[PDB]
Design a binder for this molecule. Sequence first.
Ligand SMILES: NC(=O)CC[C@H](N)C(=O)O
Ligand SMILES: NC(=O)CC[C@H](N)C(=O)O
Ligand SMILES: NC(=O)CC[C@H](N)C(=O)O
Ligand SMILES: [Mg+2]
Ligand SMILES: [Mg+2]
Ligand SMILES: [Mg+2]
Ligand SMILES: [Mg+2]
Ligand SMILES: [Mg+2]
Ligand SMILES: [Mg+2]
Lengths: 443, 443, 443
Amino acid sequence: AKYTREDIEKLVKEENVKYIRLQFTDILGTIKNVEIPVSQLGKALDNKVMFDGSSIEGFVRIEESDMYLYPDLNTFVIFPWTAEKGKVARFICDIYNPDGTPFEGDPRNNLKRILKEMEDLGFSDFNLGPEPEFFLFKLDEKGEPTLELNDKGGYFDLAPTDLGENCRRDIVLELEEMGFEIEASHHEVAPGQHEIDFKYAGAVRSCDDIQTFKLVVKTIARKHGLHATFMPKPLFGVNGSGMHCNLSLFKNGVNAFFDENADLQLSETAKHFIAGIVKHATSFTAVTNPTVNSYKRLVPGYEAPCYVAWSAQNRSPLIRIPASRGISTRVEVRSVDPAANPYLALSVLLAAGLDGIKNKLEAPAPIDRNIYVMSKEERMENGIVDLPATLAEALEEFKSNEVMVKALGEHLFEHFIEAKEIEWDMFRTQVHPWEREQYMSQY
Amino acid sequence: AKYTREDIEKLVKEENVKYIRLQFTDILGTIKNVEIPVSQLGKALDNKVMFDGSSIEGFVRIEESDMYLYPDLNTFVIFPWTAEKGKVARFICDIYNPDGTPFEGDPRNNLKRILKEMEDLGFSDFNLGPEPEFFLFKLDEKGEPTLELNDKGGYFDLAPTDLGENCRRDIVLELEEMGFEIEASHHEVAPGQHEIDFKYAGAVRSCDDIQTFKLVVKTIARKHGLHATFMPKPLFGVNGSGMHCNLSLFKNGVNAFFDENADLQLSETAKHFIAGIVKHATSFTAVTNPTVNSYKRLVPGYEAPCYVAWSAQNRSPLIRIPASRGISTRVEVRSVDPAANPYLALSVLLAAGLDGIKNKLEAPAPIDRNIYVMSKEERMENGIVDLPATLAEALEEFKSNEVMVKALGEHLFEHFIEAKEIEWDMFRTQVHPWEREQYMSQY
Amino acid sequence: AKYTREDIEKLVKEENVKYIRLQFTDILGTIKNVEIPVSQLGKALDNKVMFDGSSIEGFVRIEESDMYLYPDLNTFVIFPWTAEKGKVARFICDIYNPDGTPFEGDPRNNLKRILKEMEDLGFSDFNLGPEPEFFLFKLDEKGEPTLELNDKGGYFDLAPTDLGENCRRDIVLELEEMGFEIEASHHEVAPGQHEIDFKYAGAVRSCDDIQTFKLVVKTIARKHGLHATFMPKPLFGVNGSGMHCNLSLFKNGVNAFFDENADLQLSETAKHFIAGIVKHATSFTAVTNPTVNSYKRLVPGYEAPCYVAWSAQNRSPLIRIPASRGISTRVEVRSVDPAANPYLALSVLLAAGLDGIKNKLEAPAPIDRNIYVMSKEERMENGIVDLPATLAEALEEFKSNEVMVKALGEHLFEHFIEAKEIEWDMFRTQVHPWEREQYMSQY
Ligand SMILES: NC(=O)CC[C@H](N)C(=O)O
Ligand SMILES: NC(=O)CC[C@H](N)C(=O)O
Ligand SMILES: NC(=O)CC[C@H](N)C(=O)O
Ligand SMILES: [Mg+2]
Ligand SMILES: [Mg+2]
Ligand SMILES: [Mg+2]
Ligand SMILES: [Mg+2]
Ligand SMILES: [Mg+2]
Ligand SMILES: [Mg+2]
């Protein structure tokens, strides 16, 4: 209980807040919001503020259904950049049905349902250390984004010299005021690409920070005449952006993934986790990579996962176990990207792992080998399966997997598939310029 | 034996030919060619003219391999538009190995191998009446094609008024001089789209005319400041172009598809044919629709096949049996498109039909029903299977089918798949503008 | 020492530092870093902050590997230009392996190693007084560099008036606030060319500054709407840039090069040092001139070394010995340029010098006449050899030398050659406009 009803009231008044954003997340991971004037804070904290809950299912809405917003006193934050008379504050809310019961369609609640499922197995915490990457493009005369990158930096270079303005820098500074515990940032492989790494955090909190992060990144970027984008693969030929997820299970307050005695200092629970992730990897990809373009990133040669396998040191594995041990022992999943709905993404990732731990699934053999060279022949000769090549392919796999499906719930699942199937269909019937440049005159 | 060595020599001289085009077709259906000066006609008719035969496998060439061109005295034609001193004549050739044996890689020969397979069953002829459709676009200042259509006509309208120049009209006139037996032409559904229907003709000859047709259509069109294209789906939202194939089997010189006594006046042989086509339809689609874009046409709502079924009157069936009976009784296959390699396309279509006749496969029930409305539920409840949605999907189906695979031969098959797999892969890793307009700012 | 963890602690607290850059250097001499918030300072000073150490190898990276950063409390500096609200501080860190051992691939480490061999042979310090040269170009509308120079000044001219804006002055001023001790600065031979000479300092201090200098320069240059470049030869026909290195060996705190009563006042050790550099010059040229463009600077007629010879007065000696003596007695290597990686260039130059000292090599006769006039044949009659003409030549030469290869270490060496070999290969296969301007019509 970070803040209390009174701690919140004292703050809004002393900090002269005049605008409160009650934010939430829909089925597509998009950051939704219902804003009210400070004069309504009371009604907000009372959980009486209603809104059309059908907005949580995204562009698949069919009917208007009244619902409540239950603000989380802990998510209370104030936006520094907004200043003077008009100071804005936010509240990440939870959606409840008119009767008082939590809305199944809400993805944030889904993560809670699965976390509860975690505690029923004996685990206390499930931390997540995200590695969100993004691209910054220049803005044209008007205000529309162009294909020009904000810089020409490389992997870990000293991008935009401190003098003047430096987006990445200025973003981190804003995130600190709000209360972010950023680990560190750097310039990414491709020119104009940036990365801000978060610190360890509980599932829900960590996921809430991912949503806010994008908001702070997009806003500040626009304030510097730039355009921030978390699109997996904005440009063909250059590196794509991913959102590595460093997962870690705890029991009684201790890292349940550490074992200073077993190989790689990993415990039986850790390896079972690895197994669960490997068994469902190709099945939950539709969730960790929800967009069509998400699969243009999952192409070999750009340090992005393409096959289900884990290692401690490799070109670009699906699962990677960082050097750090002890309380830092963690399982990194590199397939996840920034376009993924954090709440849903973690739910499915938690369900996969827990499935292996609960059923004591056997973890495959590490592979410090090279998947890049060996053709599919060896990949077949070995337990190396490829990840779905298209959104369509991933959606067919997701449906078959029963634990993954039940990981999202009846309501969430139903709509997720409906939204994506339409999304895909829209893309498959589209005629791209590339098609004409290849056929228009050749045929 | 339309022409003879002497009939050819007398013609070239009297018509003052100064340039001979020895043409052939590669694996991708592209019209290849090796041109020689009239002074070499003798060496040509002697079958001594060599060329790099690796050019028949297309962009998958790996080594240079000398081969011979064996001109077909029957395919001898003279291009009317080419005039004066420089009159051009052509010769569709056959490829032979240095030793004197026919090249397996040659698609035109493949059709001959399968036609021979037809005669071994008791059939004399296998006629084909093609319905090639195309689009005409305007040319910009320079000479590059634009997205502007040559007109705004509709289905069977009186497009471009006779006065001045009218491509479609002027094309037909050129085709007649050369000796084409055109049935009739009209304006197609979509604006700027045209169709010239051929008359009944033997497989090989009919296929040879399809190749020449495209050549005459592309050339004359350019001569009118226009750009002709046989690309399946040039524009999203407008009708696509297909190449309906009206097939018909003969025995002893009579239409083996007619039976003035059985239902629909169709014979047992005709229905067996229907069965063969239905059993392999989804398997040979990769051949009758070889390009990626070929599947943007196979989308509902544009009068293009989307499900395996046959009828005599329906929205847009895969197999259609024209009204005409007697010697005109024929089985129309509407899935085939202009981008298809005629020689390969027919081979696979002949093999499918013959498979049903040889094994007396049972033909499904006609369907004057509506596939467009009934969801996949009924399509499942019925023997209604969908055609492959992507080139990839069609290529996976083609490989599994054994009769279809053996319908192309070891050498042809091997390369066809290699070329398409690469083609597809090129397309799947591409980042289309559509992707950014949908994600660039949404994420 | 210079700073204590407490000194830094107080400074960052009093100077209101908010951003901390932990910088280092990759194999290509490129300035890199990992940025962390001031709240992570403790973890930084605790040597716990990690990063992907593969970033050290540059574009030749293969697999991501965790590593630690050890901040050098003495390299702590505070960038003045950074706004009060967001003060930025830096720390040139050292790269270590997960097990607490110095990473062999770290360039700054290698220099430290070579310096140990210097201490073993009985030497106290090894000073370096670099003469960085650089050009300044104008920025177009999109902040893009142009071939337009910043002034039409000459050698030592009073380039750019004391107008409101004057990059060179403003650079030296900013460096003064950063604790940089600059000897003097002037305007170079070519228009828009500038030079800033630092006071001599230790091998590491000097290198670390060469890095910081490049950063400050480029930074302040961008603030003035200009673009700073250390590219050895930006424009054809104009002078190139070279970072002359004034080397000075110390023994027991005194100048081991000076000799009161000795020919030319150069001690024995001094002479051997000269010899050490002459036999290894052609070999270590690939390190002190790491780019393809570097060799375009190494051409006669522009005050750039083209032959291996030393002298006190000459047109363009590879090794020049300035006037001043005593503790100012030094050896200047003029072949080195600003694109070279300071740490690697100093390691190869120190190695060559120590080779000549430990093996008592005899120094050749100093060339005091014009070497430009002596034909290729003449230079052969005397001890006169040409430096590598192209990067490729320099590379093969470098591998042929053992003491030089050991100067970089197997790990550093393997990657250097890898990067440069693929680098040259790109250049070699490139087709330049020049080639087309010279063969397009002539052929
Ligand atoms: N070094 C890296 O972590 C690169 C990650 C890369 N941007 C990706 O697509 O995952
Ligand atoms: N009426 C028609 O035959 C239309 C055919 C349509 N152009 C197709 O794609 O097949
Ligand atoms: N010191 C100078 O005169 C500079 C000479 C020239 N810039 C070089 O290449 O070294
Ligand atoms: Mg990364
Ligand atoms: Mg990572
Ligand atoms: Mg038609
Ligand atoms: Mg038709
Ligand atoms: Mg100088
Ligand atoms: Mg000098």
